[PDB]
Ligand binder design. Sequence first.
Ligand SMILES: [Zn+2]
Lengths: 78, 49, 209, 50, 199
Amino acid sequence: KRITTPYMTKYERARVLGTRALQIAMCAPVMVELEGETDPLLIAMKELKARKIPIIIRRYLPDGSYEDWGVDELIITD
Amino acid sequence: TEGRSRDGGLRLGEMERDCLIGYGASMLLLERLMISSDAFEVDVCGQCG
Amino acid sequence: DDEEETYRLWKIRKTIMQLCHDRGYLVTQDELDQTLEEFKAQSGDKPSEGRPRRTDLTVLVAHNDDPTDQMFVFFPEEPKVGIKTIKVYCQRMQEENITRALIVVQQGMTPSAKQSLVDMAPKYILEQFLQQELLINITEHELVPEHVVMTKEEVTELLARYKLRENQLPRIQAGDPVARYFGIKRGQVVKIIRPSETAGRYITYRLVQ
Amino acid sequence: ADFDGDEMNLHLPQTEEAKAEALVLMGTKANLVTPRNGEPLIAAIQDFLT
Amino acid sequence: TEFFFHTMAGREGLVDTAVKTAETGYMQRRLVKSLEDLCSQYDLTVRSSTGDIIQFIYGGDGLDPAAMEGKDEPLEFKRVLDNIKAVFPCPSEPALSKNELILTTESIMKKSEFLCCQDSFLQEIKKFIKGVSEKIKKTRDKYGINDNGTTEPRVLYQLDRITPTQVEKFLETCRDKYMRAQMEPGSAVGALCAQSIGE
DNA sequence: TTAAGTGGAGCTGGATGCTCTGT
DNA sequence: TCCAGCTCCACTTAA
RNA sequence: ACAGAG
Ligand SMILES: [Zn+2]
């Protein structure tokens, strides 16, 4: 079982969008069908809303254990 | 450099640093206060330190 | 005076009974509810009343752990207690094979006597109380929460629930008044029940160190 | 700020990761309320209230 | 002479502003250096950098000061129920009685997703719903309303109206607003504390 | 008589807001 | 311009 | 080192 909160925090959201934007700025495959957007961060926001981002967030408890959460299975929110 | 006469640039003070910590903005604080000022590389010997 | 002096010997005795009850010594319902006008019966006004050896307590046995674990409370009459009076109380305590005592000093204690209580023995532990501290039961003061001394089987759950070591808990000093009141020692944990602004409660923990 | 010859500073983050942390965490729409008492600070002012 | 005294009283405000910079900026620097290491952790604790505990749960509740819709409290139930009545009025549904409201509330509140709330918050909702239920009785006793819905001047059912759909939407809105008001792990909670006392 | 532990008094070293804009 | 530590020196207890 | 500005 995983005990930590199911909601994506603003810090997780900020760094997933950042790391995905940096990966889309380099020549990575885009998982959504882009529609003439050029700005990498705008493309990363479409992938987050479409739940297509291939990142796992490893939440770290202070004793050193960890939980692997998929970005697609957290509850995203504004 | 220090100012307008010398095309100096602007300061991120100790107080602006305290603002950015409170946002949790760890990479922006690394970009502003390392990458766009004084990024460098040193050779460090792992034996003597 | 004499009206005021007896008032102290009632309030001090009343607080010591509640202190002994909260430590888990056997205290009877008529000791805790001993009224001022009832105190006047066994010991009366100051000429009849005796302070050094009439108001002493020894009936207190640690009824939870064992009836042989027993504790004194002593009320010296000299305002500054020297080592002589300590040695007097120690050898009386040695004869009875009691290992704990409370000494209730009236103004203070001389420095060489204070040093003795650290080193007389680890197996003969004596706690200084000033009577000016016992005129007000701090466990009933509005700013002091409920403290509860935790059992080892509960400390082992606290450290398991958070995956802590002991030295990551917050600290409480042994010189703290409420630490002295419960007589706790280094390595015990106290549960503290802080009152909320609402009906609820918040639970926190401290380590004696 | 009070528009009486006041000056303000501008910084352009030079990194994609620094854009995202600026946009999501430090955006004005994410900061309509002060952290202190939770009250709104971006709201109407003189000539928008009158 | 009046102008001189008014100028005396005025300069004490000018001189306070000139002093207030040095009087306060040092104070805020000390606060930040002391508090900056404190981060709210994923196990709902507040720890220093060395790993010692400052608090076992942030602020006693775990809740975020920036999310408080009330005076230091996460919701204001009177406002939230009025909102749900006006966004979702349900003209085709019956108005619940005192007993039917309590029964239908405890049917929803025993669902599995409500178990993740702190028990103090579940008591406050039940205390509020019990309060609402007593107003329905007082009105229906005054006007002679019968709980079976049969009474002829139908406008009487507007007085303290509440419908099952509105109760369901109310409990979901409260439970959601509580979960989203928790202090999110990672939050640099000492730096917010430092600046909130300094400013 | 004096060994010693602890009170009270004077000496010492530290600190005192953030930036641009010019001579 | 204001404020904690460090050291020197009288002042009782105790043997 | 002084004067300014917010
Ligand atoms: Zn080397």
